[model samples]
Target: IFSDRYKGQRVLGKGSFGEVILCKDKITGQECAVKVISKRQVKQKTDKESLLREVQLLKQLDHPNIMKLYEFFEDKGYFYLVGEVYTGGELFDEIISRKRFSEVDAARIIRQVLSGITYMHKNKIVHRDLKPENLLLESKSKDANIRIIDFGLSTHFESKKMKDKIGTAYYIAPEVLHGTYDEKCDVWSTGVILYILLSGCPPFNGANEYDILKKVEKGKYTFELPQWKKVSESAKDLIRKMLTYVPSMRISARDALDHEWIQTYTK
Candidate 1:
């Protein structure tokens, strides 16, 4: 059992399969988070396959903004995923507490996000689910770094095309809903995150999931609101390029990193 090598502590959080626990590596004496997934709970064949795929993909990724997977193992009853521990909390919670972030702050956050996405895209890995909920802060400090997490919906698309409608409704790209997309889809999700960061609202909204998705598919939104009045035109222009209807014309993560808005504010 992994218990001989690592000691599990308190419950950090819980998910559909199991829970994440604070753990200490016995040999190295380092603290980390261990995600424990119950084999019994993961009954579906696809679910098991997804988990294994996520593990395999994560094992190969190494970047400052990406969450590090230190190790992976399984016992008779559960799968253990050990990784770095993030203390600041989800970016979604940070946004909730602050309501709206300043343009400089928003740009700083998005710059790091784009850098991570750029690396992922260059490596041919697409983080299909890119949302604030999947972004974690390294600590509670003023300049805590962002760490991208959750690869269950991510995949390596070296030479294949994707057709599944796999993403959160609010952040899902219009092309994604149409059932064919690529790494550019992550840029669209980042655009939605940027919109929310600056305006304190999603670009598309409705009473129901269907209503929201219809608006997303239509790909029509405006910056006429009061919150957008103070934002720079360059920022909005980047958003326009990112949220473009045609996936082929959409901004790439690498190009988004070179945008004037990101270039100016990140420094």
Candidate 2:
């Protein structure tokens, strides 16, 4: 059947549902990523619904920075989702090896991410989960671009409100913790990513999750000397607005795209 079209090479990653395998398209010899999901392992109806919603959202979005889902197939006990292959690795992992990660590089990365998330927001889709793990790179070259992946936690809301505690605690906004949020929550996660890109460290940290929640609650973080001494004030200003405690005051992805810091290197 579909196996005749895709030849699996090896497992790339694994998750609760199943694993994503590196594959080659027999017809074109194109490198591809195939997500294999076991129906029996997907125990909950909500999980099934979420998987369908992810597929729906992926089918609807067609931005260059977002991962593409070419097609999907269903067997008796498994679902095979064929997607674009990403070989560069995670953005965070790439950054770790960099001797000197610059603001321009950070700007370029955020610009692409914001471009993708902005597209999602314009379409009324909230990527409830946005983190380094979900951000994949397409190649190992410096010019390689990021592709947003894993939409299992994403959803659309006509009412323009989401009232669920559904994001990874580290990247999740404070409002999401309160059980009510909007698309702006993604902006908050972007803020976290921006912070990490600039400093190579998370802004909020604690001895434990409870301790971390306390820091997130106050929404107060500092750009201490030595670490942020080289970072420009304009870049810091945008980060401040993005990490604002009040979601209403937080900068929208569209508006963030217009920020001078983001536009500086994008051009």
Candidate 3:
């Protein structure tokens, strides 16, 4: 267990659990992000179990595109998670700032996320949540190294079947809303991310989350007119395959990695 070997710099991010702070190693001065979750704030046994489960999942993972948890420590009132530093900022913010947001960039980011998801799926864990906010850049460089974050919503399964109604409404898959789903749910969310990245708007939109979910539940979306006219046929085709109504029909993360668009990018 690490002691007071680090000092806080500033907050990097925050969630329901707690805030992530930028910290400097007192001994080595190396920078890292410390996720500070409060023990007192936990209201039930399941929530504590969920928090511990996240640590377990994080420890089981090791991949270039996945966020790394280096150390963990429990103090009098907080659980401190020491992890790698990512200074690049959120992927969603970067996309909004892009002048044109080229297809190559979209494919590159999606490829990285698919690779990471493939790794997790192979390990029997489903990310469950795969929104833009959970994607982080490793640096503020043009290279744009992407890392998948937030395992608090993840779960490990012995089979490709789980019944949990958890996830952001817009990205939730039809099967999940129906109370049964698997790793393909992440694939669906990734498809939504790809759609938003390429089009600047979600395929499904409603006045509120309830309305948006209604659209998602019915799989009502389009690739028409002004927004999609410029998108390539191949890109639109992939999105269609991913956002298919049947979860079994959606493209797998491994297959997505081998897709022509991803293969063509960064070459």
Q: Report lDDT (CA) for all predictions.
A: 0.80, 0.78, 0.77
Whose lDDT is higher: candidate 1's or candidate 3's? Answer: 1
Error of 1 at 93 (Å): 3.1
Better of 2 and 3 by TM-score: 3
- What is candidate 2's lDDT per residue for 29-148, written digit by digit as tens? 998888776666544335556656666766766888988887767678777878888889888888888887789989988999999989888877777668788888989987888998
> Please, what are the lDDT tens digits per residue for candidate 3 over residues 1-267?
555788888887674356788888889999988877676754333555565776776786799998887777776777787888888888889888878778888898888898899998887767776788789998999876899886533441111111222236778788877989888898899999999888888887876777888899889788874878888888887888888888887888898777777887756
Tell how far residue 63 is off in model 3, in angstroms: 1.9
Model 3 has an lDDT value of 0.77
Top model number, lDDT: 1
What ranking of all candidate models by lDDT puts the best one first? Answer: 1, 2, 3
For each candidate, give its TM-score against the true structure: 0.84, 0.83, 0.84
Better of 1 and 2 by lDDT: 1
In candidate 3, which residue pairs get closer than 3 Å at backbone N, Cα or C atoms, i.e. clash? none
Report how far off residue 223 is in candidate 1 (Å): 1.4
lDDT of 3 at 197: 83
